[PDB]
Structure formats: structure tokens, C-alpha cells
Amino acid sequence: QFDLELHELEQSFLGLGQLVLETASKALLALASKDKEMAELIINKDHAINQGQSAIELTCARLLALPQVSDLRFVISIMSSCSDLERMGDHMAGIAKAVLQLKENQLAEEQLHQMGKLSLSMLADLLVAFPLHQASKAISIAQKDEQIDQYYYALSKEIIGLMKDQESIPNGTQYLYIIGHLERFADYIANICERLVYLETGELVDL
Amino acid sequence: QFDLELHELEQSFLGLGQLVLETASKALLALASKDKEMAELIINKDHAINQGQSAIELTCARLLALPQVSDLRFVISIMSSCSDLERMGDHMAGIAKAVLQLKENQLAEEQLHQMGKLSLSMLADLLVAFPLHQASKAISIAQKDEQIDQYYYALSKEIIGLMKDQESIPNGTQYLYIIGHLERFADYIANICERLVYLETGELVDL
Ligand SMILES: [Zn+2]
Ligand SMILES: [Zn+2]
Ligand SMILES: [Zn+2]
Ligand SMILES: [Zn+2]
Ligand SMILES: [Zn+2]
Ligand SMILES: [Zn+2]
């Protein structure tokens, strides 16, 4: 009964995570296609992720009452992870906002698509890995953040570099935010990964 | 009794936050004075912040059992905020690690000191504001993050700019990390601020 309740709580959380995977996907499509209308719908739907988090937070908080070791680590992991997920969500709304500030006009792409693709697959991997409670799949996912950081710096060096080589900054500033939003998105995934290692291990360790 | 218990839970959390304010202060002093030994003690003491968080997380989780609206929002706020605090802590250990990678040799400072000073005072303000549960003091603190972002971009443009004007990157890369650690530190403070508005308001809103 309680085990069934926890399991149901896990499904609520994956539902939320699937919702943020979809909006991340939508955010990046709105960016590739310069779809300012799709960006606006993303911005307006962000509150449903906030709402979904509070619902989960609340059934977590009440579940503690209606009690032991691994189950305690579990409910704490859902509470902590659903929060990281709404912050992931906000950073996808952030990318949608930067898309509204884009002028075309000129100028910038494929590296960004790659940083985006690795961000998405990290979350999709996490969502499959999470129900397994496998520390090692979590750890391997977290490790791919090294690559996103490399994308982050390479793209930062390039974008601001695009002033001294030849002069563009309305869009530049916007692409700086975008890559910062992806870098943060991926950092939270890594945070959810560490929570997963804590769940199997009993100790939150830093990765 | 329960109200006294919550109050005591709040003091545990401020204790943790005072600990992270101290280590942030120590991190930045270790940076100003190039004290590689102080950096090492920061790195090794990070686990006590992890430990303090788990203790708080655990008395939170158990407190729900030993039950109403504002008190529910409260315990959820402590659980969520103590986590942001250990991530703040990790970013201060991160700065300490970058200090170990610094060569002197050359080259870079005062702008960084300023970004650092505003980061610290934001947390010190938050720690005083938190027991008041005043949404407005939280909101005013969160707003100062705009300035830290401005420091972040100005210092990023400058540091990487310091290759094309004249060529330095071991240290450059390290000062990029440092300013990224401060920028993240300050972002989590803003996150704790929003949790405070949610506590008075009943809704997590995005700032
Ligand atoms: Zn099922
Ligand atoms: Zn990262
Ligand atoms: Zn950590
Ligand atoms: Zn007291
Ligand atoms: Zn910031
Ligand atoms: Zn948010």
C-alpha cells in the first residue's frame, strides 16, 4: 500500500520530468525555427510546471505521516528533484524569452544544436534511469555535463569574440543567455543524478 | 511545542547558512591573498555542510509526522533552502579549487572583489531577513542579482578578451570558473528568496 503510494509518487515526478523534457524540446525547436509564437506559449505554460511541483511537494510532505530508512531518502529525493525540475523548466522559458529578443537581421548555430541535443538526451536518459535507482547510470549521465561545459566556454569565447574580429550585440547578448540557460539546465540534471547516488548510497556526494 | 520545534528547525538552517557565509568569506580571502593552504581546508570541510544539510533534511522529514498550511510551506521551505545552501557551499569549494590552479606568474581584480562583496552581503542580508518571513525584504535581495549578472558578463568579456588584445589562459580559465561560481552562489540566494515569497504568499513565483 505504502510501496504502491511511493511508486505512484515516483510516476507523478517522471510525469513532471517528461513535461520539462517536452518543453525543453519545444524551446529548442522554437529557437531553431525562430518561432516567436511557440516561444510565447512556452512562457505562458511555465506556471503549470510550478503547479505540478507544488502538487508533488505536497503529497510528499503528507506521505511522511500516513517512516523508514530507504523510503525516507526516497521521498526526500523526489522533493529535492522536482524543484530542480521546475528550475530546469524556468531556463527553458528563459530560452523562449531570448527568442523573442532575436532580430533577423543578423547574426549568430550547429554547435548550439549539439549542446542542445546533449542536454535533451541527458534528461531523457535520466528519466529512464531514475526508476531503476541505479547509482551508476546516474553517474554516467552526470559525467556528460563536462561536454556541455566545453560547449558553454567554446560558444562564449566565440560569441563575444564576434565583436573584436568584426563588430552585433543585441543578438550576441541573447545567445549568451541561451547557452547559459542550457548550461544551467544540464547542471540541474547532474544535481538530480547526485540525489540518485545518495538514494542508493545514503550519502550525498559531490560530482 | 511544535511551534518551538519549528523555530528550532529554523535556527539549525540559519546555523547552516552562517556556516556557508563564513566559508564564502574564507574562499574569497583565500583568493585575495592567494592562500593555497586555506583553500585546501575549505575543500576538506565541504562535507560538514553536506552533513549539516542531511541532519536538517532528516528532522524536517520526521517533523511532518510528530500538519497544517503555513507550517507545511515552512518545513518545505527549509528542506528546499538547505539544499540550495549546500550547493552555495560547493561553489565556494569550487573557488578554493581554482585558487590551487592559480600561477603567479601572471596575470588577472577589484571588480572581482566587488562581485564578491555583493555576493556576501546578499547572503548576510538573507540570513537576517529569513526569520522575519518578509516577502519584500526577500524580493529586494533577489533583485541585486541583476548586478552580479552584470559583473559576470563584464568580467567574462574582459577575461577572454585578454587573449586577442595580447595573448594567459591557465589563469584565465580559472578566473572564468571563479566568476561562474560566484554567479551561481548568488543565483541560489535568489532561489531562497523566492521560497520566502512562496512562504508568505502560498505560491512559488519566478523572479
Ligand atoms: Zn505503475
Ligand atoms: Zn555545467
Ligand atoms: Zn553538492
Ligand atoms: Zn530560539
Ligand atoms: Zn545570476
Ligand atoms: Zn522557478
From Swiss-Prot, chains A, B:
Full protein name: Phosphate-specific transport system accessory protein PhoU homolog
Primary location group: cytoplasm
Family: Belongs to the PhoU family.
InterPro entries, per the entry: P_transport_PhoU, PhoU-like_sf, PhoU_dom
Pfam families: PhoU (PF01895)
Cross-referenced Gene3D superfamilies: Phosphate transport system protein phou homolog 2, domain 2 (1.20.58.220)
Highest taxon of source: Bacteria
Subcellular location: Cytoplasm
Function: Plays a role in the regulation of phosphate uptake.
GO BP: any one term: intracellular phosphate ion homeostasis
The protein's assembly and partners: Homodimer.
MF terms in GO: protein homodimerization activity
